[PDB]
Structures are given as C-alpha cells and as structure tokens.
Amino acid sequence: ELGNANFENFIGATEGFSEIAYQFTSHILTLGYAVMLAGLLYFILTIKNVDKKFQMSNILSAVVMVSAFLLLYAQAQNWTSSFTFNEEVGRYFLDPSGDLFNNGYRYLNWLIDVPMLLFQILFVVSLTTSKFSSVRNQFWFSGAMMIITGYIGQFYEVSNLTAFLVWGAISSAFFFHILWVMKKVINEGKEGISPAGQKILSNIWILFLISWTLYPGAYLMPYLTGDGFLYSEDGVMARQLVYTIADVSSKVIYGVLLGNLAITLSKNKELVEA
Amino acid sequence: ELGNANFENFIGATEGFSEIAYQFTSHILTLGYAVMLAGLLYFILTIKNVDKKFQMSNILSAVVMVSAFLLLYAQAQNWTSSFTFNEEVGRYFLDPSGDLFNNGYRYLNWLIDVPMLLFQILFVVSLTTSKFSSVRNQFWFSGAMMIITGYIGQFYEVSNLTAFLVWGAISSAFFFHILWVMKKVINEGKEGISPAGQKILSNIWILFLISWTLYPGAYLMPYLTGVDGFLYSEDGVMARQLVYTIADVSSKVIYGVLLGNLAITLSKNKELVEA
Amino acid sequence: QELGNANFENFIGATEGFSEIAYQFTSHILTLGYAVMLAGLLYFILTIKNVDKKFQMSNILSAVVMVSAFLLLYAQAQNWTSSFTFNEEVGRYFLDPSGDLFNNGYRYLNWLIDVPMLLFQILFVVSLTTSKFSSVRNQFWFSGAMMIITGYIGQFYEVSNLTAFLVWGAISSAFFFHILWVMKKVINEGKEGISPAGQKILSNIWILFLISWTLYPGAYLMPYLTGDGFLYSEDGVMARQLVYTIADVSSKVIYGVLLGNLAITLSKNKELVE
Amino acid sequence: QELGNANFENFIGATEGFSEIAYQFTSHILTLGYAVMLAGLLYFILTIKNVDKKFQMSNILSAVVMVSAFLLLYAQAQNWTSSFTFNEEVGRYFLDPSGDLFNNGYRYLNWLIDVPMLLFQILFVVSLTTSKFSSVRNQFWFSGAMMIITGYIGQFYEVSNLTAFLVWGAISSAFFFHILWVMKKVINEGKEGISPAGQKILSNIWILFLISWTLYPGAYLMPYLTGDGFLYSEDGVMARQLVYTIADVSSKVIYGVLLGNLAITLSKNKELVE
Amino acid sequence: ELGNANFENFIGATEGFSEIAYQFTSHILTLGYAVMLAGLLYFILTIKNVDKKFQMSNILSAVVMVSAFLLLYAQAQNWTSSFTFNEEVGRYFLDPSGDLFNNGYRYLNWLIDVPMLLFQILFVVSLTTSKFSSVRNQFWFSGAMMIITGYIGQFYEVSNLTAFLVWGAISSAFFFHILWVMKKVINEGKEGISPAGQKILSNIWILFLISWTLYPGAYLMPYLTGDGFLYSEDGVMARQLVYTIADVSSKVIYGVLLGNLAITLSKNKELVE
Numbered sequence A: 001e002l003g004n005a006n007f008e009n010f011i012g013a014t015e016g017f018s019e020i021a022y023q024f025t026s027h028i029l030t031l032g033y034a035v036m037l038a039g040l041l042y043f044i045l046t047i048k049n050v051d052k053k054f055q056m057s058n059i060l061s062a063v064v065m066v067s068a069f070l071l072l073y074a075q076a077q078n079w080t081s082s083f084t085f086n087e088e089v090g091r092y093f094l095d096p097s098g099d100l101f102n103n104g105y106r107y108l109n110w111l112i113d114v115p116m117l118l119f120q121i122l123f124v125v126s127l128t129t130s131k132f133s134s135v136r137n138q139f140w141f142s143g144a145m146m147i148i149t150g151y152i153g154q155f156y157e158v159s160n161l162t163a164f165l166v167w168g169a170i171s172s173a174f175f176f177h178i179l180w181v182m183k184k185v186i187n188e189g190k191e192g193i194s195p196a197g198q199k200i201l202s203n204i205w206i207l208f209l210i211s212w213t214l215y216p217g218a219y220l221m222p223y224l225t226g227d228g229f230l231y232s233e234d235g236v237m238a239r240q241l242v243y244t245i246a247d248v249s250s251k252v253i254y255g256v257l258l259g260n261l262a263i264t265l266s267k268n269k270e271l272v273e274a
Numbered sequence B: 001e002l003g004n005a006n007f008e009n010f011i012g013a014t015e016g017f018s019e020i021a022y023q024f025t026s027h028i029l030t031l032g033y034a035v036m037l038a039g040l041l042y043f044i045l046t047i048k049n050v051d052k053k054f055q056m057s058n059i060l061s062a063v064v065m066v067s068a069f070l071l072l073y074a075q076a077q078n079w080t081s082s083f084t085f086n087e088e089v090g091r092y093f094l095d096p097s098g099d100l101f102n103n104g105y106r107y108l109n110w111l112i113d114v115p116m117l118l119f120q121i122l123f124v125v126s127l128t129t130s131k132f133s134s135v136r137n138q139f140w141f142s143g144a145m146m147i148i149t150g151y152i153g154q155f156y157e158v159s160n161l162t163a164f165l166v167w168g169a170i171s172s173a174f175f176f177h178i179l180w181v182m183k184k185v186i187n188e189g190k191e192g193i194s195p196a197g198q199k200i201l202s203n204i205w206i207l208f209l210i211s212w213t214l215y216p217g218a219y220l221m222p223y224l225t226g227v228d229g230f231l232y233s234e235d236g237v238m239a240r241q242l243v244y245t246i247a248d249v250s251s252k253v254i255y256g257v258l259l260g261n262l263a264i265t266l267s268k269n270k271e272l273v274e275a
Numbered sequence C, D: 001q002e003l004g005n006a007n008f009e010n011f012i013g014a015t016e017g018f019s020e021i022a023y024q025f026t027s028h029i030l031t032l033g034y035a036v037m038l039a040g041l042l043y044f045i046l047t048i049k050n051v052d053k054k055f056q057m058s059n060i061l062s063a064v065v066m067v068s069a070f071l072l073l074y075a076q077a078q079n080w081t082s083s084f085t086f087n088e089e090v091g092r093y094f095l096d097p098s099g100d101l102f103n104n105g106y107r108y109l110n111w112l113i114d115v116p117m118l119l120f121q122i123l124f125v126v127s128l129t130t131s132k133f134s135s136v137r138n139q140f141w142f143s144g145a146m147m148i149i150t151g152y153i154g155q156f157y158e159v160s161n162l163t164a165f166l167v168w169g170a171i172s173s174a175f176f177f178h179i180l181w182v183m184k185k186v187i188n189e190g191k192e193g194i195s196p197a198g199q200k201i202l203s204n205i206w207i208l209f210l211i212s213w214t215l216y217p218g219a220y221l222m223p224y225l226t227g228d229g230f231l232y233s234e235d236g237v238m239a240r241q242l243v244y245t246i247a248d249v250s251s252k253v254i255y256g257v258l259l260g261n262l263a264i265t266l267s268k269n270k271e272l273v274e
Numbered sequence E: 001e002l003g004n005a006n007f008e009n010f011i012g013a014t015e016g017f018s019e020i021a022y023q024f025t026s027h028i029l030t031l032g033y034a035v036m037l038a039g040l041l042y043f044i045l046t047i048k049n050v051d052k053k054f055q056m057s058n059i060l061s062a063v064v065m066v067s068a069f070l071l072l073y074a075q076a077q078n079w080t081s082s083f084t085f086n087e088e089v090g091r092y093f094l095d096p097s098g099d100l101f102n103n104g105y106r107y108l109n110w111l112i113d114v115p116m117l118l119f120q121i122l123f124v125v126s127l128t129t130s131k132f133s134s135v136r137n138q139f140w141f142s143g144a145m146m147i148i149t150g151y152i153g154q155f156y157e158v159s160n161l162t163a164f165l166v167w168g169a170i171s172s173a174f175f176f177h178i179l180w181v182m183k184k185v186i187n188e189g190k191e192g193i194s195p196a197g198q199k200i201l202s203n204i205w206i207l208f209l210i211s212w213t214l215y216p217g218a219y220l221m222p223y224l225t226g227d228g229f230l231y232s233e234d235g236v237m238a239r240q241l242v243y244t245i246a247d248v249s250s251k252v253i254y255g256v257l258l259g260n261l262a263i264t265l266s267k268n269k270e271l272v273e
C-alpha cells in the first residue's frame, strides 16, 4: 500500500531500477541544483554592468537561483535516500525508511519561482499599451493556480488517473493563459528597442515556449506511451531529465538572455560580446 | 506516553500521516527556509540603492533572513526526521529515535526576529509625537513577552488545554499592545512623506495586520473545530504548517521588501524598484 | 553508568532523563545560539563601509568572532541532539552512548579563540592615556588564555571530582578578575578625550561587559548553586545552557554592536545607526 | 554480488577489497579535488576587479565552473566513502550495497556543464583572425557535448561489455581530436595581435590544455592499460582517481588562472599577477 | 588486522580513549577548521587596504583558508566517526563502520597549501640576488616532495617503523632545503623596506621556523618517548593539538603577518595599528 504516491515509487517497488537508471537519475538531479548555484554567480557578477533601471532582473534571477538550488538539492536527496541497491538481484528498490520519492519539492520551487521569472522581464523591457500592474497580477494569479492545481494532480498520477488528468487539464488552462500574456509582453517589449535587443527577445520567446511546454510533457511522461514503453525505469529517467533540462532552460538560460539584453541596453555590450 | 508534546506527534503516533499530508508539510517547510535565504540576496543586492540613513532597515532585514533560514531549516529537518513511512499500512508514523516534533525552533526564531522587524521600520519613518527610544522599548518588551508566553503555552496544546489557553491569552494581551503601537507608528510615519511613500506604509499595515493575526490562528489550529472535525487531524497539521510558512514569509520577506521599497523611493532611487 | 570524567548533563540524561520541555528547550536555545552568530556576522560585514579605516579592525575582528562562534556553537548544538534519544516507553530523553557523550568543550574552545579578540578589539576604537598598548594586550591575551584553559580542565571534573572542579574554577577566577581590572582601566582611559556620545557608549559597554562575563562562572557552577538541590536536575541543564547562550550573545554580538556603533560615531557616520 | 552495468571500482571492492592505503588515498585525493574547486572560486571572484570589462566574462565563467565542479566533485567524493566499508576481520574495505554502487557519473556530468564553458571562455579574452566566432563556438559546444555524452554511456560498460566500452570510447575520441584541432586554431589566432607577454601565456595554456585533456582518456582506460594485469586492481582505482583529480584541477583551475592572468595583463594590471 | 593504519586506531582499538582524550581531540580538531574559515574573513575584509601589487598575497591566503577549512573539516569528522563510546567501560573505541582514522586529509591539505604559502611571500617582498623563477620552483618542487614522502611514511608509523623513518628522513631533507631558501628570501626581502616592514619579516621568520618544526614533532609524537608515555591517548591528544597549533600558525598567523606587511607597505598602516 503506497497510496497517493508518484509512479517512480511503483517502478521502484516492483521492477526496481537498473544501475544505469538509478545512477543517471541521481547524476542528472545533482547536475540540476549544481547548475542553479553556479548560475547565481553569473547574475551576482554581471550586476555591476546592468544599469540601475534593469538591475532588479539580475536580482530576481539571483533570488530564483538560491531558492532553486535549495529545493532541487532536497529533490536530489529525496531520490537517493528513497531507493537502495539490492545485492541479490543487482537493482535499486524502494526504501520506506528514506521516505517515498515525490516531485513536490520541484513543484513548490515553481510556486516561488514562476511569479519571479514572469515578473522579472518587466524590469528589462517596457510595455506599450498594457498596464504593468495588470500583466503582473495576471502572471502571478495564473502562475500560482497553474502550479497549485498541478501540484495536487501529480499526487494522483498513479492512484487516480481521472483526478490526475482533471487537475492537469485545469492547470493547462492556467498554463495556456500565461503563454498568451507573455507573447503580448514580448511584442510590446520589442517596440522601442534596437534590432540587437529585438533579436534577443525573439530567442527568449522560443526558449520560453519550448522550455515551458516540456513541463506538461514530463507530467504525462509515464503515460505518453499508454503499460507501454515509458511506464518503466526508462520513463523515470525521461521525466527527470526533462524536468532538469526544463528548469535549467527556464531559469538559468532564460535569466542569462534577459541579463544579456539588460546589459546591452546599458551600453555595456562588451561584457556579453566576444 | 508522549507528555508535553505538540499535537503533530499525537496524530503521528495514532492516525499516522498520509503521503500527501507528510510530503506537503515536508515541502512547505522546505519552501519556508528556501525563501528566507533567497530573500537575503534581495536585501544584500539592493542595499547600495538605499541612502545611508535608511540602510539599517536593509541590514536588519538581512539579519532576520539568515537567522530565519537557519532555524526554519532546523524546523524542516525536525519534521522529516520525526515521522517514518510504514510500508504495511502506507502512512507515516512517529519515529521516537528522530526525536519528537516541536514548533519551538520557529518560536525561538520569533524571539530574535520580532524585535528587529518592529525596530527596523523606525529607520525609514519619522515619528511625530512619539520618541524613537520609547516605541522601541515597548516593541522589545512586549515582543519578547508575547513570544516567551506563547512558547510556554504551545508545549501544553495537548497535555493541558487550560495552560495552553491561559498562556495564549496572556500572549494575546502583549500582541494587541504591539498592534496598537505599530498603528501609531505607521500613522506618524505617514505624516511628512510623499503620497507614494504613504501608500506603501498603507500596504505595510494591511500586510502587518493580516500576517501577524495568522500566527494565533495557527496556534489554535488543532482546536478551531473543537475536539473533532477537519482540524484535529493530519488536515490540521498541514493547515498549521502552511499558515506558519505563509505568515513567516509575509511578516519578514514581503514586509522587508515593502520597507526596502519605501527606503529606496525615499532615497530618490525608485528606478530599480519600479520598471 | 560508568561515564567517567563527563559533564553533569550526561548523568541527568543517564538516570532521570530529560522531559520533552527540557530537551526541546535546550535543543532550541542552543540552535538560537549559533543562528544569532551567523546573523550577527552579516551586521558587521554590512556596516564596515561606515567606519573609518583606523577603527575598521574592530568590525573585522567582530566578524571573525562571529564565524568561529557559529561553527563551534553549531557543533555544540549537534552534540546536544546527538547525545540524547527519546524513550518511547516513559516519554523522556535519555543518554545515547553512540551519539557520543555531551560536553561543553566546543563552547570553551570557542572562548579560547574569541576572548583574546574581544579584549583586543576595543583597543582599536579607544585610545589609552597612561597604560601601554603592548602591556594591556599581553595581559588580556595571557590571562584570557589561562582563564579558559583552566576552566576547560575544571569542567571535565564537575561531577567526577568536585575538588579539582572548584580548584581549577578558582584559579580561572583569579585570571578573570585580572581581566576585569584591566578592562575597567581601558574603558576609563578610553573615555578620556572622546566625545560625550562616545563616552556614553563606553559606559554601556562596561555594564554589558560586566554583567555578561559574570554570567559565565554562574553557569559553570549552575548544577550546584543549590547544593542534590533544585538545579541538580534537568532544570539545571536548561538553566546552564540558557545562560551560556545569553552570555555568548551578549559578550560577542551585543558587545560587538556597541563597539561598532562607537567606531561609527567616531567616524561621523552616525546617521546610519540613528 | 550481482553488480551489472557498474564501474570497475565496485568489482575490485566486491572481491579483492581495498587496502587502507588504497581506500584512504582515493578518499583523500577526491576530497582534495572539490576542495581545490571552491578555493579556486575565491581567486576568480577576488581578481575580477582587475580585469577590464571586455574580458570579464572569462573570470565569471571560471567562477561558474568552480561552483558546479565543487558541488559535483563533492558528490563524487561522498559516493566513494559511502560505497566501501572497513571489514574488521580482514582489515580491508569492501563494497557496501546500502551506500549505493560507486559510479564516476557525477564527474562526467560535471564535464557536460563545464566543457562548453572552458572552451567558450577563452574566446572572451582573445580575438580570432581568420575564423568565425560563431562557428568555433558551435563546434566546441557540439563536439564537447557529444564527446562527454558518448563517454558517459561507455563507462557504464567498462566491465559489463568491453566492446561497447571501446566503441563509445572511440566515438568520443573522434570528437576529442576535433576539439583539440579547433582549440589549436584558436590559440594561434589568439596569439596574433597581443603583446609577447600575453603570447607566452597562450603558449603555456596550450601545453596545459593538451596534457591535461589527454589525461582523461588515459583514466577512462586505466583498468586495462596493462591488460588481469597490474592496473586491474586497487592500484588501478587509485591511479584513475588521482589522474581524474589532477586532470580536473589542471583543466579548470590552472587553465582558468592562466586565462585570468592573460586577461589581467591585457588590462594593464600586470602588477597584480607579478 | 588494522594494517597500514595510523597509531590512533591502535590505541582506539585496544586501550580505548577516555572522555577527556576523545572530547579534547574532537574539540581541538573542530577549532582547527573553525579558525580557517574565520581567517578567510580577515583576508577578504582587509584586501581593499593592500595596494594592487601585493594583493595576491591576500588572495592566496584566502585560497588557503578555504582549502584548509574543507579538508580540516573532513579531518575532524574522520575523528568523530571513527571512535564510539562504550557504555560498559566508559571509553571510546575504534568503530569500523565510521572508517579507520587517518591524518591523510591534513597531509593532502599541505600538498595544496604549502606551495601557496611559500609562493605568496614573493608577492610582498622583492628578492635582490636570487631569481624569482628559481626560488619559486625550488619551493614548489621541494614542497611537493616533502609532503608526498611524508604522506607515504605516516601510513607506516605503526606497521613498518623503518619505512616510517626512511620516508620521514627523505622528507626532512627537502624540509631543510625549504628552510634554507626561505631564510634567503626573508633577508633579501628585508633589503629595501622600512624598519617597520623589516621587523615584521623578522617575526614572520620566527613564526615560520617554530611552526614548521612542530610538524615533524607531531609526525614522531607517538615515539618521542620510545612503549613510553606518548604511545597512548596522551600521544594522540598531543599530536592533534600540535598539528592544529601548527596549521593555525603556519597559515593564519603567517598570513596575517604577511597581510600586515602588505598593508604597511601601502599607505594605510592605520588599519593594522
């Protein structure tokens, strides 16, 4: 009786994980939080070369990095504590004492981080006809709701497929909403900045779009092949890779590109340019 | 025989916690201390854009963040160490070896932090009819007493409902006193600063009022449906720990940010705070 | 229970056990201890810019103390929690041999590094009149070391051998009064030739120095201050560890703050502190 | 036990066991590893003020690498110690299943982050002549990724399947030479247009780059470089882990230092480095 | 069968450690790494007050402090992990699970740190007759070899007294060489700086000499009294105190004195006075 548990635990409690599956997941999750703390240094070290008006972008990035490090660290330790090598069969199996594995650390990370990442672009670019205050509140409300609904759903990703998908769908509503507003902001952002600045905002959009889509991909990962191929250790590896790739892109790379824009806009483009 | 223990331990020792209840509490408590360390960075990184006379506000915020991180971290680890998964029934139960769970880490955090948060506003605003030193001492005395009395009470929140509520009440006395003085401060603060600065102080009050009220809510959370119903159970534990987390974040970080923003605007450097 | 040359906490823990309140409180207060130290560090780092160059070593030495103190007081807190385990049957915490015996030695060795600095550091802020920098320092340093080293030896015996306990205690006290004597000299010579604002602070410093430093020998004797009386119990343990914590905070952080404030005023940057 | 697709360390540890010297040394050297990384970080942070704006991203990227490397090399060190337990009966360290299997994957995934940055970062110090920044970078980035990813896969098989081991190894080596080729191009074009002092450093960088990068494939093959021969033993383990450590220190820290020194000289702040 | 293990483990495996012996060793080793991280703050905080050309001294100190913290921390945890209280007899005994105790963390710390400490003086002072490049390489080569040989020897300090002392001796060769060169450096350093600067370099030498000598003292500590007085828990305490005192002196105090010299040599001597 595992109960309302993530699917990792069900694989780990039956099939077990192979060396490669466990170690890789372990490694990738470690890379996750490593990249976050590393990134922090980039934002701290470049802040002197951002003008005052843009500086909060760098600061908010830095804030995200710290939050993310700590929670993604917790997530990594959740993985390793939760599954123990069985000497007899040569596979890793669920260890009750280390607690059940749960992706909740990541999700709660999103709860802090999502509002900031959406907010923080608004310090770099300027809107035309839209109201800063409105855009922010929309971001913040939709963002919260997207994560909170998703957070509830994923508890059920095995126990109750319907609640899984209901909450998932509702989340997607809130998800799809955010995409709309962000496109609005990038477009109004593009108005009034050099072609150089424009090109960056274009890259940002593609990054934002791809990277944010990854998340619901990883939500569904176990099932994207119906007891098929990804309902296995392969699925676990796949989920945790994608989450890691997503989080790195959506925070660090995202933050870097914003920072680069803010730096160029400050006529300190020499720092970012080679 | 648990004794003078928090009610979490009694739930954990009888009902057990469901996966969702345990994991959520675990997650939210982690979010708690994560946000504190994160916040620290905000205060450090904005300090250059506060004028010298306001800068102690920023510094005191930073101080709080560090204290809070460390003690809230301790609090999170208290939770996780104290309750272990039972594979047979699929619920988390009290682990004696990991020590009893207690909210005391949080409370003693308050003991350091409350004085600073009350103190620190006084470096941004200027009073009219009150003396800096008087307001501070009131804050500091009442603040200490509020926490110390509350701290004693919560040990009894199961063992002895009377002492629970006595100490609770006494605490509440000092609580209202602080509210009273703070309202005085924010009003005198509002006198003589631009409308922009005024509006922030207004938000600060609302935040201060709502967020500080949460705490006694969370104190009583187990019993807010008396002797039964949703709140004397794992649901109550989740509820308490969410509210504490929300409270602590609001009362320290958000509070500190709003003060910081005020101090930054007052320094004629509003450009990084608003854009 | 063949405990040997052990602190009295272990003897209580090994017989009576600690109640929930006693254990948790001690645990909490010891945590507060090291938390306050690291917090304080931030104050000293962040204020250094506002003290003039010639006083700045006071701030630096404070910062140094804070770090040392954090690490050792952290170790001390972990010593407490490791050393006593909840007994499910009776609902009290009892000595756990595996987690090592509890010992206040971490704290004492902290004193060994910290005491010389705290005595030294005032000399950067004040100017002596009649007394010789070199003499005052060496006296502080010699007496300071000896006070701690003798105390450190004594406390091992606070149960095993009451005589050595009190002998070493007394010897320590000799050096204690010496330090008090010299420090009073310093504060008074310090007061000669500095602004009234500076004077007032040095007055406060002395009161704080005096009260806070007296606490220590109080806590040394705490188990016995009521002869098998009231404080030879879990109550005594709580009492000792509260007092040590209060002492250490006052004698380092508050002390350091007051010195900092003095150094800041003497630099004509008093707008920060008011 | 039944180990599967595991590193060879585990097979030694599961049969021969490790001697005190072998275990302790490996333990010590791996600790040195991550210690040096965090230490290095301090150098890059502290010297950045003395590099001109246009070079500064070199120092920043170094700093980023240091942090990533600390965290992952720390993980790697703890992987070693957790995985092998002293057996009091024989006086040798043996594989502990509970501490999880040892795997070098932490290191490899560290490479995945770090390799692109180290190759990238030189381009902020020097200017190319005949080559296109964009092309050189993409080659570095693509080949770098592929080199590590292929290597990462191979090393899982270094015992289980020697053919896959060597295939993947070889494929990796393809991309390796490519990177070497491009880097030589870069260092030469880099040398064009800077003082002889700067030139001399770029020369040293190349020899360091060349030697240090070569070490890695040496360490890949280390168990077999003597066929059930001399290095298929605890000696081989020691040898591998020393070489990896030496490589990583050289290829990141020393490499980074030399680049930093170049950037400092180019900024006419050569007095710092002299 | 402990094998090629440090002597601490043999005491811990037979005699056991008394409360005082264990706790003291535990405490002192903790003080060790605590002082390192503390020191770091001093070097970071004073850096602004040393001129550009001396600044690498402060930086190299800072680097050492961090390395030292981490490895001395590891060393402290090695001690506590390795010996467990026995409730029946009231003594601490060797715990296999916590791994055998070994001073190797410290030694490998030396491997990183020795080159820097020898190097770093050269950023503050200027040589007269001797060649920067040569002095450094001598320091670096001899320094490495001194540690590597010592590191090998100490594994044998119980198992094989001959290898212990051979490797020890070889190490000592390189040791004196470093002492020789350093004296050369301090003297050439003294040429062309004020008497104030001179006096500091004099203190540095005394400190350098005393503190560095301590190390081989601690190497031999178990035997310095032949089944004698120091082949006991007393010897363990003695070794670990001396190592701690040595490391603090040879890095932190050393670094401070150099920093003070660098600060003095710059306009702003007021900070250190």
Ligand SMILES: *C/C=C(C)/C=C/C=C(C)/C=C/C1=C(C)CCCC1(C)C
Binding pocket: A109, A110, A113, A114, A117, A146, A147, A149, A150, A151, A168, A169, A171, A172, A175, A212, A213, A215, A216, A219, A247, A250, A251
């Ligand atoms: C730094 C973290 C970020 C940017 C997280 C973003 C998370 C999402 C976009 C999540 C989206 C989800 C859905 C659209 C459906 C399933 C539930 C979620 C929350 C994973």
Ligand SMILES: *C/C=C(C)/C=C/C=C(C)/C=C/C1=C(C)CCCC1(C)C
Binding pocket: B109, B110, B113, B114, B117, B146, B147, B149, B150, B151, B168, B169, B171, B172, B175, B212, B213, B215, B216, B219, B248, B251, B252
């Ligand atoms: C950062 C922490 C803060 C601002 C803590 C505030 C705590 C309170 C306002 C506590 C109030 C209480 C009562 C009014 C009654 C019950 C006992 C307390 C202490 C929880």
Ligand SMILES: *C/C=C(C)/C=C/C=C(C)/C=C/C1=C(C)CCCC1(C)C
Binding pocket: C110, C111, C114, C115, C118, C147, C148, C150, C151, C152, C169, C170, C172, C173, C176, C213, C214, C216, C217, C220, C248, C251, C252
């Ligand atoms: C930061 C730590 C400080 C300022 C420690 C001060 C410690 C003392 C003044 C200790 C005094 C003692 C006696 C006077 C008798 C008993 C032994 C001592 C060392 C506790």
Ligand SMILES: *C/C=C(C)/C=C/C=C(C)/C=C/C1=C(C)CCCC1(C)C
Binding pocket: D110, D111, D114, D115, D118, D147, D148, D150, D151, D152, D169, D170, D172, D173, D176, D213, D214, D216, D217, D220, D248, D251, D252
């Ligand atoms: C900081 C880490 C660096 C610079 C890592 C470099 C790694 C390599 C050059 C690895 C090369 C390999 C081969 C050429 C064959 C075997 C597989 C590899 C990846 C170890």
Ligand SMILES: *C/C=C(C)/C=C/C=C(C)/C=C/C1=C(C)CCCC1(C)C
Binding pocket: E109, E110, E113, E114, E117, E146, E147, E149, E150, E151, E168, E169, E171, E172, E175, E212, E213, E215, E216, E219, E247, E250, E251
């Ligand atoms: C910061 C660490 C330092 C300065 C270490 C210095 C170490 C030595 C001078 C060691 C000397 C030794 C001998 C001369 C003989 C025995 C082996 C050694 C390495 C301990």
Ligand code: NA
Binding pocket: A080, A081, A082, A083, A084, A085, D098, D099, D100
């Ligand atoms: Na595991």
Ligand code: NA
Binding pocket: A099, B079, B080, B081, B082, B083, B084, B085
């Ligand atoms: Na748990």
Ligand code: NA
Binding pocket: B099, C080, C081, C082, C083, C084, C085, C086
């Ligand atoms: Na305990």
Ligand code: NA
Binding pocket: D081, D082, D083, D084, D085, D086, E097, E098, E099
């Ligand atoms: Na081990």
Ligand code: NA
Binding pocket: C098, C099, C100, E079, E080, E081, E082, E083, E084, E085
């Ligand atoms: Na132990």
